[PDB]
Design a binder for this molecule. Structure first.
Ligand SMILES: O=c1ccn([C@H]2C[C@H](O)[C@@H](CO)O2)c(=O)[nH]1
Length: 228
């Protein structure tokens, strides 16, 4: 796998090169990319190719302050755009995102919320919203969960963590908690139940947004304005 070509095909911003280029030397990455291309030739795959790595464009690795792990992208046209949980700005927030935003509002009663679910503002501020599976077949939830994205994304996150001590991780649900296992002595690891509508545990009481900011302050890092 050649970086220049990989970067050009996915419109990846070059600041992420040191964290992603090494993944191209792993033989399994080639297998993953071949399967992804195969899928694209036989299925309507989402999000559009140009958005699969949008997360590399909103901020650089050194700007990342918080990492929020997702599972699979939304599988309906017009929803997913490369960031975990986020939807394009004309889409009413789907249930799990609605649940996340309710907790944000509970944490920050004075937050001026927009009503939309596009998290571009958080991403530009260094909130890395990364799904462990980056693509999906339209109309079939979690359909690409076994093609190999999770190992690739895991590699990137592991490299980011080693390069960047003091990150805050928000691991919501069993899947996120099993896939990502940061050293709790080097990073702030926050766990909660899934904001998924299937969870019978209210996500509205999640105080991670506030806990994260207190942690960043003890490390002399500016806090995140969670309004969106
Ligand atoms: O980018 C996304 C979109 C959705 N979901 C999740 C939350 C929940 O498990 C289900 C949506 O109800 O998929 C993610 O993890 N990442």
């Amino acid at each position: 796998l050649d970086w220049t070509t990989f970067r050009r095909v996915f419109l990846i911003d070059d600041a992420w090169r040191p964290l992603m280029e090494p993944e191209l030397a792993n033989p399994l990455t080639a297998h993953l990319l071949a399967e992804y291309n195969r899928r694209c030739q036989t299925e309507e795959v989402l999000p559009p190719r140009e958005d699969v790595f949008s997360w590399t464009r909103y901020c650089t690795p050194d700007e990342v302050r918080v990492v929020i792990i997702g599972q699979n992208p939304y599988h309906h046209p017009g929803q997913a755009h490369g960031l975990a949980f986020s939807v394009r700005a004309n889409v009413p927030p789907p249930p799990s995102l609605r649940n996340v935003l309710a907790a944000v509002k509970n944490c920050y009663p004075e937050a001026r919320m927009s009503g939309h679910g596009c998290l571009e503002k958080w991403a530009r501020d260094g909130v890395l919203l990364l799904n462990t599976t980056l693509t999906v077949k339209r109309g079939a939830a979690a359909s690409h969960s076994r093609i190999g994205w999770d190992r690739f994304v895991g590699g990137v996150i592991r490299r980011l963590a080693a390069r960047r001590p003091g990150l805050v991780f928000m691991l919501w649900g069993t899947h996120a908690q099993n896939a990502i296992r940061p050293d709790p002595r080097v990073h702030c690891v926050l766990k909660f139940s899934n904001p998924s509508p299937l969870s019978k545990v209210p996500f509205g009481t999640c105080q991670h947004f506030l806990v994260a900011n207190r942690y960043l302050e003890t490390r002399s890092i500016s806090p995140i304005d969670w309004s969106v």
